[PDB]
Write a protein that binds this ligand. Structure first.
Ligand SMILES: CCCCCC/C=C\CCCCCCCC(=O)O[C@H](COC(=O)CCCCCCCCCCCCCCC)COP(=O)(O)OCCN
Ligand SMILES: CCCCCC/C=C\CCCCCCCC(=O)O[C@H](COC(=O)CCCCCCCCCCCCCCC)COP(=O)(O)OCCN
Ligand SMILES: C[C@@H]([C@H](N)C(=O)N[C@H](C(=O)O)[C@H]1O[C@@H](n2ccc(=O)[nH]c2=O)[C@H](O)[C@@H]1O)[C@H](O)c1ccc(O)cn1
Ligand SMILES: C[C@@H]([C@H](N)C(=O)N[C@H](C(=O)O)[C@H]1O[C@@H](n2ccc(=O)[nH]c2=O)[C@H](O)[C@@H]1O)[C@H](O)c1ccc(O)cn1
Ligand SMILES: CCCCCCCCCCCCCC
Ligand SMILES: CCCCCCCCCCCCCC
Ligand SMILES: CCCCCCCCCCCCCC
Ligand SMILES: CCCCCCCCCCCCCC
Ligand SMILES: CCCCCCCCCCCCCC
Ligand SMILES: CCCCCCCCCCCCCC
Ligand SMILES: CCCCCCCCCCCCCC
Ligand SMILES: CCCCCCCCCCCCCC
Ligand SMILES: CCCCCCCCCCCCCC
Ligand SMILES: CCCCCCCCCCCCCC
Ligand SMILES: CCCCCCCCCCCCCC
Ligand SMILES: CCCCCCCCCCCCCC
Ligand SMILES: CCCCCCCCCCCCCC
Ligand SMILES: CCCCCCCCCCCCCC
Ligand SMILES: CCCCCCCCCCCCCC
Ligand SMILES: CCCCCCCCCCCCCC
Ligand SMILES: CCCCCCCCCCCC
Ligand SMILES: CCCCCCCCCCCC
Ligand SMILES: CCCCCCCCCCCC
Ligand SMILES: CCCCCCCCCCCC
Ligand SMILES: CCCCCCCCCCCC
Ligand SMILES: CCCCCCCCCCCC
Ligand SMILES: CCCCCCCCCCCC
Ligand SMILES: CCCCCCCCCCCC
Ligand SMILES: CCCCCCC
Ligand SMILES: CCCCCCC
Ligand SMILES: CCCCCCC
Ligand SMILES: CCCCCCC
Ligand SMILES: CCCCCCC
Ligand SMILES: CCCCCCC
Ligand SMILES: CCCCCCC
Ligand SMILES: CCCCCCC
Ligand SMILES: CCCCCCC
Ligand SMILES: CCCCCCC
Ligand SMILES: CCCCCCC
Ligand SMILES: CCCCCCC
Ligand SMILES: CCCCCCC
Ligand SMILES: CCCCCCC
Lengths: 729, 729
């Protein structure tokens, strides 16, 4: 044929079956648009930022009247099953169908499907699941055969398939994705585009933001994820938060998919994540949404105003600039740098909201090795984005916000830093609460609490040493049975700690009715748990405070110890130099039956003598003093050596600063020996001092203060939403 | 031309200059043998064990009367300078020249050079230093041009050059290797053979033992390293130990090359290694030689009787057999498995001798990162060979030794295991000696020794934590300035420890003349240092007890802590799975000026419909219950996961067992708290207990007992040698 100005663009038909199905939808089979009968394949052979320059287009811009996209739903996928992708697509099509049935809308209506463009971006053709390709092909958005690797000695970077389908998923069973095309389906503009090389997930967003977003010029860019099924109208509810111009990015609630009839609650790891997510979306997102800066907008379900992110925010997201600390480690916070650069944008008053009435059930890990590896990225990004946000807090005052909002933002950044400092010292805080609570009960009532205080300290020491060693030089999949054992041991430690607290609390009552432990029950059961329960109730979602709350408590020591140790030990995912330099090729010999071969060799006396003199002048012009500089590292081998140095100086600084607090409260590290020796000069060490009780009270009142601030934030969020509801009635 | 039975063999001439030089040597230029005028190049394209089978030969077997090789000197080299190789070659040619001038010999004489075959084996052609190639080419054993990469679609495994040279090195300056050919030179049968691929060092010995040793059938095989210059007659003295049939392997003294006028003694790291080597060859080699089993025969200078190692010992050395502990990890002890399998050989009474009068100065690391990486292999091999030797000690009694020697060997194995147990607990032993000595001086005399006991404990804790973290997840070359700082800090700790010992020793004397510390001076200065001095003196080599003995003491804490921590943290040199699976190739498009290209595409309704149904039956026959088993690891990624599990279970077991002793002597780990709490039940902790003094005395009397056993062994060795000297007068 002929290509489209240096671009391979083939406009092929779909199939007889799909055409018949689509024709059943319309009242007249003759009047079927030109978008449902074809599937335009393009071979993009350039960078995403050069898409418009290299004359690559999409089908939305080639209509007689160009379509103005209002939502660009972006579904990043990689090796996900057809059930995970089908679950995400069913939510999108339910949202589009809901957004078409609306009547009292100035944006949505009978022709609302032309404003949404669904853009599935798979990460590598070699890694995509064949069942996912089968599902996309059954939707009319993928045909086998047109996947050319190279176009005019230019490698193809992406294969872009686009087809406005009429097929909608209507049911996702455990093994079946039901695809009906009746009179009650809506068209979906599919733009499934899969890469050739697996260039991670940030590059998928680079393709969706610097690439197709530039051509589409959408208003909002909702970033879904493969496996994350939004609600019946959650994307529409998330889009409703952009009615006021100030919002330049919003996020919804992400729930946990508990399976058929809540079957996954039996898994203690899934139930713990359920409660953690519910608390994150009741106390963290609601509190941060009041100030106007949400720490992370989840990549699984979030929406950005395109105008808000275009420019400096996306510039630091993708490139972000030597080996400097804030420029070489900025990639740890993948999409958390996109939230800080939008709120703190020069001459722009952007804020981030959290939509309570827009949910999206996701798929969470069910196994410890898969759960630990996920939270390493989460913890590393959250730590590196909090350090970046606090250090660059002066950029709030260089933005276009008013003074009233700037003050709230700088108050929130201090609170976020205080939370970061609490989470940094959690390794020492848990050990000190455990060690003070199990020693102060062995002094008060002795009996078997004596040897139990030594058994559980040694068990802690062994489980923490082994976690440090298995995290620095071993993989979680290598040792799955030990990480589960460590989680079980820390759960036993938490059970013992709770028992000790209840015992010393009931004994204090029976001593008064017939102190550090007297106010220990109005600090962690009445001021902390009751506030969580009330916050969950006022959120109108209290059913997780009993279904999945014990598994969270029993697994919290694993969150503090196993999870943070592994996150801090694998900061940078090192690989070390692996090049394998190759020598210059030499000649070839291919003998015959008798073995005679060509003669092109050197036998001449002069020719041999010249080589001998060449090897004789090398020995004669060595010149040791002017020794050539030893070959210095490359960049990938020099850059790994810096990531290793940053990684190790973080573990050392995090272990030493946590131990300094343990060395001050419990007087370990020779501190007690030194104090006793001074008294000798002017010979015994006390077991428990007065610093231990003061620290215990302080570290359990900080937990109550954080819960109280989070409760106040949640209440303010709910009250403001209720007032915006009573005024829009 | 024509090849030699499927083998590329070219018999080229050398050069006009070399022929003239050789002709100057002979009285008549016409009567020059055929071996000095040619250089037979061969292209070996097979495994070393198939060398004879695939009709590959050497020049000694093609004479009219085949030459019987008596010594096969094997010089393994890899990327070494031309000075390092020239230094090794000068010693070999001095030895050959010494072995020709002998007259009262039934093996050596005017034609003794026909029995020695020097076999240089370089490890990779891409890595060999071009100046080393220049030096070999100037010796007439390498010509550029004949290095074919493949012979009849069969990759060339080695390029074998062989030429009996007449050129001898007579002086090695800092940058010049003097090559004269006068009337006082001896021929050297060179067999320089370099590989194509860098297959490590064990494969070089596989080529030298299963390969050219099979063809040559030598009596002795001396293993040198490029850079190790033997003495004027050290190889002859080493060969002289094989006169008695019992010896099936011998080794000489390895010294340190201190440079021109002992310039390298300024380096404290070189001076420390000097003393360590001196003591190793005065107290370890001499003591072990009496029993008849030397723990390691150094790869830099050792000799094996060919018939002694030929068979089961070499089979274990090279292949040595699942993931079993003694079969998967036995490669850690590279050549230490060759020593144990020779002494404990079925129906063979082989013993290993140590030759005092055969030395070889070597090149030692001058920088901390290079010194740490070398000693990792040494420590790991010595630990894995001691565990193997002790566990398989029953194989001594299944060998052909007599009962008297079997009893001596089983007595030696228990002593070697006791030394291994001491070196395993050195991490705790040093800390306990340091902590007991700096606390017991702060109680006795207070003053500034109080805060110094806490500063130095915290300094130790920081330097040990940082060494553990920098060893598990960082490379020594990445952090060179920190390892030097850690060595300096441990040297300061040793200076303080020595000061504390001297202080408390002089105070005890001034208290008695006007106890754990009273006998502290007759345990570590009179029973340990005096025995070292006397052993060095009776060895007739005492000059290192003063030149390089302070730098050894100041660097011993680094040997105990930095060196062992790094060795135990990097047991297996992991790399983790790095494969990068590739997808199937797709089509190609090459457009023309107008962009028209060939049409071989699918447009047919049936052909598209068949693909659509193919992607519709994949979505229809998912069958989740009969789910395909998840793709299990390969072998290189499954074998790394086992080396990681063995590596981590060694660090955990080595840290926990060392801390148990610290938890028993100092009562840390809640032991003191638990002891005080029992007294509460029937409230203060003592600073120093009576267990600390008992352990201090025990751990400093074990040091004296080991030194006494080593002194007795050295004295017996010297006395036996003196009696063998007075009888052979
Ligand atoms: C020999 C075994 C080696 C094991 C190595 C494990 C891996 C990494 C490095 C660990 C560094 C500490 C090594 C062991 C030191 C030790 O067992 O020493 C003890 C405990 O001392 C304490 O407090 C210990 C407190 C816990 C330390 C946590 C890890 C290190 C964090 C940073 C360290 C900073 C400096 C710490 C200095 C101690 C001194 O007990 P004592 O004689 O005072 O008891 C008097 C009772 N009446
Ligand atoms: C919060 C900081 C975490 C740092 C993590 C560093 C890396 C690896 C794991 C280390 C495990 C130990 C964590 C810290 C425990 C600790 O600081 O706890 C202290 C010291 O306790 C002791 O003895 C400590 C002795 C030294 C421990 C050596 C390393 C571990 C060896 C293997 C484990 C063996 C069992 C260890 C049990 C502790 C309890 O002091 P105390 O309240 O009794 O002092 C009463 C004074 N009147
Ligand atoms: C964890 C997340 C979801 N379960 C998930 O796993 N998301 C992946 C990710 O974000 O890493 C997705 O990234 C894409 N991906 C991955 C690898 C690659 O190499 N290339 C590539 O494109 C895939 O779509 C892949 O599913 C969950 O919803 C969630 C819950 C709470 C929260 O606060 C934030 N998120
Ligand atoms: C350390 C040793 C010597 N300084 C040395 O470094 N020997 C290397 C080694 O044994 O590893 C040699 O091995 C060869 N090699 C190396 C890498 C490779 O990839 N391929 C390859 O062939 C090279 O000849 C290389 O010099 C010293 O003499 C000594 C002192 C005391 C003792 O008890 C034992 N040994
Ligand atoms: C979570 C952040 C903790 C920061 C340190 C808190 C404790 C400070 C010492 C308290 C006891 C002081 C006794 C004199
Ligand atoms: C005086 C009574 C002592 C009773 C000791 C009981 C010990 C029980 C075994 C250890 C249990 C450890 C649970 C983690
Ligand atoms: C005199 C009685 C002393 C008892 C000491 C008990 C020490 C127990 C240490 C912790 C062992 C933990 C095993 C997991
Ligand atoms: C006293 C010994 C304690 C051992 C603790 C567990 C160590 C586990 C290390 C990894 C082994 C392989 C697990 C799959
Ligand atoms: C299929 C793997 C399931 C793993 C579930 C979580 C294991 C750890 C449980 C920790 C709590 C134990 C309480 C007794
Ligand atoms: C003062 C009366 C004490 C009676 C004995 C209490 C023993 C408690 C043991 C708890 C074991 C389970 C811990 C998780
Ligand atoms: C909050 C903790 C920060 C820890 C890292 C600080 C910066 C480290 C930079 C290391 C550079 C090493 C260059 C060789
Ligand atoms: C960063 C280097 C180590 C710093 C250690 C600081 C210890 C401070 C102890 C203060 C006294 C605590 C008991 C009153
Ligand atoms: C180097 C090997 C050491 C093995 C342990 C030695 C010490 C044993 C305890 C000594 C003190 C006992 C006090 C009751
Ligand atoms: C009562 C007198 C106290 C003197 C203290 C001296 C401290 C000197 C600084 C720390 C030196 C550390 C050397 C490693
Ligand atoms: C009452 C005075 C207390 C002094 C405490 C000093 C603690 C020192 C800890 C060690 C610091 C080491 C720095 C390298
Ligand atoms: C080249 C070295 C880079 C940094 C590696 C980590 C060294 C950490 C040493 C201790 C720092 C101070 C802790 C208080
Ligand atoms: C070129 C590098 C030389 C390194 C020499 C050794 C450094 C460590 C010395 C330890 C002893 C210091 C005594 C004060
Ligand atoms: C009993 C008199 C004591 C006088 C003060 C002694 C101080 C010693 C300090 C040593 C510093 C250097 C250690 C390496
Ligand atoms: C002397 C110390 C020996 C430590 C290692 C013991 C054997 C460990 C085997 C681990 C196998 C793990 C299989 C998953
Ligand atoms: C391997 C698991 C831990 C074992 C700890 C053993 C501790 C034994 C202590 C014995 C009492 C010491 C003071 C008298
Ligand atoms: C020289 C390159 C920038 C270095 C910035 C260091 C920031 C350290 C922050 C520490 C926070 C506790
Ligand atoms: C951020 C939380 C750090 C750890 C606080 C203590 C956790 C355990 C509390 C147990 C109370 C009985
Ligand atoms: C005086 C009797 C006190 C009994 C306390 C029982 C505490 C049980 C805690 C269970 C936590 C899961
Ligand atoms: C990052 C610093 C952590 C330690 C802070 C100081 C702890 C000691 C305070 C002593 C007060 C008497
Ligand atoms: C099952 C394969 C062989 C396992 C041999 C284990 C030997 C352990 C030795 C431990 C010495 C302390
Ligand atoms: C094998 C040696 C282990 C450590 C023994 C103690 C070393 C320091 C001795 C200091 C004496 C003053
Ligand atoms: C009473 C005075 C004692 C002085 C002790 C000095 C010890 C110096 C040791 C130096 C070791 C390198
Ligand atoms: C490998 C085992 C190391 C510890 C040996 C026992 C230590 C405690 C002995 C207690 C005697 C009272
Ligand atoms: C469904 C998996 C249940 C695991 C329970 C572990 C305690
Ligand atoms: C309207 C903004 C309210 C902020 C409340 C912060 C607690
Ligand atoms: C930019 C690095 C320093 C930040 C200081 C913030 C107060
Ligand atoms: C212009 C920067 C003002 C910072 C105020 C911090 C409270
Ligand atoms: C623009 C919103 C202002 C909120 C109140 C600030 C004090
Ligand atoms: C009273 C001592 C009991 C020891 C129990 C060890 C598990
Ligand atoms: C999934 C691995 C289970 C191990 C259980 C250890 C208690
Ligand atoms: C020749 C190198 C001397 C280094 C001295 C370091 C203390
Ligand atoms: C003749 C064998 C002597 C052995 C002595 C061992 C100490
Ligand atoms: C072969 C593994 C066990 C050895 C026991 C030696 C006593
Ligand atoms: C046949 C094995 C005998 C062992 C004796 C050990 C002393
Ligand atoms: C064969 C040498 C024997 C030495 C004496 C053994 C007791
Ligand atoms: C008397 C306290 C001195 C502290 C010195 C810290 C280095
Ligand atoms: C070779 C690096 C020297 C660092 C010195 C630190 C004291």
């Amino acid at each position: 044929f002929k290509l489209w100005n240096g671009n391979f663009v083939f406009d092929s038909p779909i199939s007889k079956t799909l055409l018949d199905q689509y024709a059943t939808t319309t009242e007249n089979a003759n009047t079927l648009p030109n978008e449902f009968k074809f599937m335009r394949y393009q071979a993009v052979t350039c960078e995403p930022n050069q898409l418009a320059e290299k004359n690559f287009t999409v089908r939305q811009l080639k209509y007689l009247t160009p379509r103005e996209t209002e939502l660009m739903l972006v579904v990043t996928m990689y090796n996900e099953d057809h059930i995970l992708l089908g679950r995400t697509l069913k939510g999108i099509m339910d949202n589009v169908k809901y957004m078409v049935k609306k009547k009292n809308s100035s944006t949505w209506g009978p022709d609302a499907w032309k404003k949404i463009v669904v853009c599935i971006i798979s990460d590598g053709r070699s890694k995509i699941n064949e069942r996912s390709l089968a599902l996309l092909s059954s939707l009319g958005c993928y045909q086998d055969g047109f996947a050319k690797d190279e176009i005019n000695e230019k490698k193809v970077a992406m294969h872009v398939y686009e087809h406005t389908t009429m097929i909608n998923i209507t049911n996702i069973s455990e093994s079946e994705v039901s695809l009906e095309c009746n009179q009650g389906t809506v068209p979906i503009q599919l733009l499934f585009c899969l890469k050739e090389q697996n260039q991670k997930k940030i590059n998928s967003h680079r393709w969706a933001f610097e690439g197709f977003a530039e051509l589409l010029r959408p208003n909002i860019v909702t970033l879904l994820d493969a496996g994350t099924m939004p609600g019946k109208d959650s994307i529409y509810q998330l889009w409703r938060e952009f009615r006021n111009p100030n919002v330049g990015g919003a996020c919804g609630e992400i729930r946990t998919d508990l399976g058929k009839r809540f079957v996954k609650l039996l898994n203690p790891l899934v139930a713990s994540q359920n409660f953690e997510y519910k608390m994150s979306n009741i106390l963290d997102k609601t509190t941060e949404s009041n100030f106007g800066f949400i720490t992370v907008l989840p990549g699984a379900f979030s929406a950005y105003r395109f105008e808000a992110v275009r420019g400096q925010p996306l510039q630091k997201y993708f490139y972000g600039e030597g080996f400097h600390f804030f420029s070489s480690n900025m990639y740890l916070a993948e999409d958390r740098i996109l939230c800080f650069e939008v709120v703190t944008k020069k001459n722009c008053n952007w804020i981030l909201k959290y939509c309570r009435s827009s949910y999206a059930s996701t798929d969470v890990p069910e196994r410890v090795p898969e759960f630990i590896l996920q939270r390493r990225r989460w913890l590393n990004g959250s730590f590196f984005a909090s350090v970046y946000s606090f250090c660059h807090f002066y950029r709030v005052w260089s933005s276009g916000h008013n003074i009233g909002r700037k003050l709230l933002l700088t108050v929130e950044f201090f609170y976020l830093f205080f939370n970061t400092l609490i989470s940094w010292f959690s390794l020492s805080s848990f050990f000190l609460v455990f060690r003070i609570l199990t020693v102060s009960i062995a002094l008060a009532y002795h009996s078997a609490f004596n040897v139990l205080s030594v058994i559980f300290l040694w068990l802690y020491g062994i489980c923490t040493l082994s976690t440090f060693i298995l995290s620095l030089g071993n993989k979680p999949k290598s040792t799955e049975k030990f990480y589960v054992l460590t989680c079980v041991i820390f759960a036993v430690m938490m059970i013992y700690m709770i028992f000790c607290s209840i015992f010393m609390s009931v004994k204090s009552f029976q001593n008064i009715l017939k102190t550090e432990a007297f106010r220990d029950i109005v600090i962690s059961l009445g001021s902390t748990y009751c506030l969580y329960l009330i916050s969950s109730i006022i959120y109108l979602q209290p059913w997780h405070m009993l279904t999945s709350f014990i598994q969270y408590i029993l697994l919290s020591p694993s969150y503090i110890n196993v999870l943070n140790i592994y996150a801090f030990c694998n900061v940078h995912d090192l690989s070390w130099g692996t090049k394998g330099a190759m020598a210059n090729p030499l000649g070839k010999i291919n003998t015959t039956e008798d073995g005679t071969f060509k003669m092109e060799v050197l036998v001449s006396s002069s020719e041999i003598q010249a080589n001998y003199d060449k090897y004789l002048k090398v020995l004669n012009d060595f010149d040791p003093k002017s020794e050539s500089r030893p070959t210095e590292p490359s960049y990938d081998e020099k850059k790994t050596g810096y990531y290793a140095n940053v990684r190790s100086l973080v573990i050392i600084f995090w272990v030493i600063t946590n131990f300094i607090i343990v060395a001050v409260v419990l007087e370990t590290g020779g501190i007690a020996d030194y104090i006793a020796m001074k008294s000798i000069s002017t010979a015994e060490i006390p077991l428990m001092t007065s610093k231990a009780s003061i620290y215990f009270n302080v570290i359990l009142w900080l937990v109550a203060l954080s819960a109280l601030i989070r409760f106040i934030g949640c209440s303010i969020y709910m009250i403001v939403r209720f007032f915006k509801k009573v005024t829009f009635r």
